[PDB]
Amino acid sequence: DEYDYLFKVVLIGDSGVGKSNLLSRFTRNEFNLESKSTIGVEFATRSIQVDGKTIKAQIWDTAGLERYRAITSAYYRGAVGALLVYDIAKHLTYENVERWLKELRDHADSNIVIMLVGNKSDLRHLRAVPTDEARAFAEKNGLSFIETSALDSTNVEAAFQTILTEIY
Amino acid sequence: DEYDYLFKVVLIGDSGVGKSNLLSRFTRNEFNLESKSTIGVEFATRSIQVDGKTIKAQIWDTAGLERYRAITSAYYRGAVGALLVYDIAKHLTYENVERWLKELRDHADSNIVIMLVGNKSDLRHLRAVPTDEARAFAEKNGLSFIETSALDSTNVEAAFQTILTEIY
Amino acid sequence: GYRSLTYEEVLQELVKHKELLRRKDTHIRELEDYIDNLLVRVMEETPSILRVPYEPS
Amino acid sequence: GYRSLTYEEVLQELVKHKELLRRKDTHIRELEDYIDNLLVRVMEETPSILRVPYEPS
Ligand SMILES: Nc1nc2c(ncn2[C@@H]2O[C@H](COP(=O)(O)OP(=O)(O)OP(=O)(O)O)[C@@H](O)[C@H]2O)c(=O)[nH]1
Ligand SMILES: Nc1nc2c(ncn2[C@@H]2O[C@H](COP(=O)(O)OP(=O)(O)OP(=O)(O)O)[C@@H](O)[C@H]2O)c(=O)[nH]1
Ligand SMILES: [Mg+2]
Ligand SMILES: [Mg+2]
Ligand SMILES: [Mg+2]
Ligand SMILES: [Mg+2]
């Protein structure tokens, strides 16, 4: 319905970290516990006020089972931000973070704003990745960092807000 | 490159009867022995002289494993001819012919020109469906009939020629 | 064709593999449905992408 | 968990089911590739069909 900027943002990260529920939570305020691996490629849009401006965030999602495939170029084409997501309760998803980083360096624009997102912060009893360790990694690598829970919503808005404002 | 008529024709019939090789043989003069079940929906076009006229035949193909699915309406939409194909060496593919007929009655235009095609006529030693039995069935049901071999090419042109001229 | 395991073991192995085929089947169906639902849209909007050979428009 | 068959039988059954999973895997890969190759085209031509929710254009 008009807007001052249209920003393409992509979700990337291991399968199971909660990419699709960060999407549905941001764009529809919906969460699904019985959430199947994403087939294909899709996007959803949401308009938000960031400063004085209205921004159409065009959020893209796909399976993070594979690294590079035929849709990869088209997926990063025109993307001005990536949310790179791991699962705070699965150390492996966090080990894979640098693998996804290389993948961005290889296929995204050199100026992509990348935010590192540790998701599933509701699983405090099951934590496998200390905030500090991830915090350390992010600043070392020029990345914004945040922890979210698509399940209970903590920081989901803040995460999209932050990346979008840093794209300005 | 211009033409006097564009005709949409669809292939239907059990999986394995040779639908996709009738397609490649008609449109590209190619045959493949190692031919996998068709995924999705596709078409290929070919222009031919039929009487004085040049006709773009737009030939559609898909898997015949399923009967009715989400693509079914769109598949028959605008189709002016169907080649309904069985395998002369597999009696089962021929038993299924009336099932495919009902499917046409249910989803195709009431004026679709339907041709019945017994394919794999190169398999003369392995014949399971006598020409007469199929010939009988076709005329009884208002259908043109022909036997082809996508493998050696017999009647493939004649088959498309006939259905296209009967669409005129 | 390969020995080693007890009849008991080869037998829960069989159960484990049946359940695995069931999961693969389900996944095949999910893939098929996604394809069909996407093709409806492709067909109604830009059917030329289904042309062979593919001419980019 | 179900008896009846000899160790020999339960054992060729296991082989038959392994070969069946291999075929399902292959099919899953074929389905995946077809999806990816179709999405490239959808993306370059009419990306709006990938919108959620789907607005027909
Ligand atoms: N506890 C908890 N579970 C979550 C959270 N986010 C997602 N999940 C669950 O984790 C599973 C995976 O979520 P998805 O959104 O499908 O993750 P995905 O990253 O998109 O998976 P792929 O499409 O295969 O790459 C689902 O069972 C979700 O319900 C969260 O914040 N907390
Ligand atoms: N001998 C012989 N084999 C044929 C002929 N036509 C097709 N075949 C073979 O039969 C098999 C099936 O051929 P296809 O063209 O893939 O048949 P299909 O009807 O399109 O199968 P689906 O896509 O699953 O519905 C392949 O192994 C072909 O090589 C023919 O005229 N003669
Ligand atoms: Mg997902
Ligand atoms: Mg990817
Ligand atoms: Mg086929
Ligand atoms: Mg059909």
Please tell me the total number of residues recorded for chain A in this structure.
168
Residue B166 beta carbon below 6 angstroms from any ligand 2 atom: no
C-alpha A32/C-alpha A138 separation (Å) is 29
The one-letter amino acid at D36:
D
CB B84 within 8 A of CB B13: yes
C-alpha A94/C-alpha A17 separation (Å) is 10
Q: With the CA atoms of B82, B88, B92 and B96 taken in that order, what torsion angle do they form, in degrees rounded to the nearest 10?
A: 20
Do chains B and D have 3 or more beta-carbon pairs under 8 angstroms? yes
Start-to-end CA span in chain A (Å): 20
Interface test with D, best of C41, C50, C55 (most D CBs within 10 A): C41
Cα dist from D52 to A41, A44, A82, A132, D49, whole Å: 11, 5, 19, 36, 9
In three-state secondary structure terms, B56 is strand
Q: What is the CA radius of gyration of chain A?
A: 15
Q: State residue B10 phi and psi, 5-degree precision.
A: -115, 145
Q: State residue B121 phi and psi, 5-degree precision.
A: -65, -15
CB-neighbour burial class of residue B108 (10 A; exposed 0-12, middle 13-18, buried 19+): buried
Report the 3 state secondary structure along chain A. CCCCEEEEEEEECCCCCCHHHHHHHHHHCCCCCCCCCCCCEEEEEEEEEECCEEEEEEEEEECCCCCCCCCHHHHHCCCCEEEEEEECCCHHHHHCHHHHHHHHHHHCCCCCEEEEEEECCCCHHHCCCCHHHHHHHHHHCCCEEEECCCCCCCCHHHHHHHHHHCCC
CB A115 within 8 A of CB A162: yes
Q: Which residues contact A105 (CB under 8 A, 6 or more apart)?
A: none
Kindly state the tokens that stand for B158: 């004649």
C-alpha B159/C-alpha B79 separation (Å) is 16
C-alpha A73/C-alpha A13 separation (Å) is 16
Q: Which residues contact B93 (CB under 8 A, 6 or more apart)?
A: B13, B14, B16, B17, B86, B87
CB B167 within 8 A of CB B7: yes
Best residue among A11, A14, A15, A20 to mutate for probing ligand 1, ranked by most atoms within 8 Å of CB = A20
Residue A153 beta carbon below 6 angstroms from any ligand 1 atom: no
Kindly state the tokens that stand for A118: 């540790």
Kindly determine whether residue B40 and residue D30, on different chains, have CB atoms separated by under 8 Å: no
Min distance C30 CA to chain D CA atoms (Å): 10
The one-letter amino acid at A126:
L
A36: annotated binding-site residue?
no
Q: Which of A84, A103, A105 is nearest to A14 (CA)?
A: A84
What contacts 24+ positions apart, CB below 8 Å, involve D28-31? D28/C24, D28/C27, D28/C28, D28/C31, D30/B36, D30/B39, D31/B39, D31/C28, D31/C31, D31/C32, D31/C35
Nearest-CB residue to C42 (from D12, D28, D42): D42
Residue B150 beta carbon below 6 angstroms from any ligand 2 atom: yes
Kindly determine whether residue C40 and residue B43, on different chains, have CB atoms separated by under 8 Å: no
Buried b (16+ CB within 10 A) or exposed e, B36-52: eebbbbbbbeeebebee
- Residue bearing the CA closest to ligand 1, atom 30: A120
C-alpha C36/C-alpha B70 separation (Å) is 6
| Residue in A with minimal Cα distance to C38 | A40
CATH number of the domain where residue B141 is located: 3.40.50.300
Best residue among B12, B15, B20 to mutate for probing ligand 2, ranked by most atoms within 8 Å of CB = B20
Report DSSP state, residue D50. Answer: G
- Would strands B113-119 and B144-147 be described as parallel, antiparallel, or unpaired? parallel
Sorted by where each starts, the structural domains of chain D and their CATH numbers stand as 1-57 (1.20.5.2440)
Q: Which of B70, B72, B64, B66 is nearest to B119 (CA)?
A: B64
The one-letter amino acid at A158:
A
Kindly determine whether residue B74 and residue C35, on different chains, have CB atoms separated by under 8 Å: no
How was this model experimentally determined? X-ray
- Residue bearing the CA closest to ligand 1, atom 12: A16
Q: Which residues of D touch C8 (CB under 8 A)?
A: none
CB-neighbour burial class of residue C4 (10 A; exposed 0-12, middle 13-18, buried 19+): exposed
Kindly state the tokens that stand for B71: 């693509």
**Which atom of ligand 1 has the smallest separation from the CA of A14?**
25
C-alpha A78/C-alpha A76 separation (Å) is 6
Owning domain of residue A140: 1-168
Q: Which residues contact B77 (CB under 8 A, 6 or more apart)?
A: none
Q: Angle, to 10 degrees, between the axis of helix C7-45 and the axis of helix D7-45?
A: 20
Cα dist from C10 to A113, B94, B135, whole Å: 53, 42, 53
For chain B, what is the domain count?
Answer: 1
Residue A94: left (phi > 0), alpha (psi -120 to 50), or beta? Answer: alpha
| Residue in B with minimal Cα distance to C55 | B44
What resolution in angstroms, rounded to 1 decimal? 2.5
CB B147 within 8 A of CB B119: yes
Q: Which of B70, B66, B55 is nearest to B12 (CA)?
A: B66
Q: What is the CA radius of gyration of chain C?
A: 21
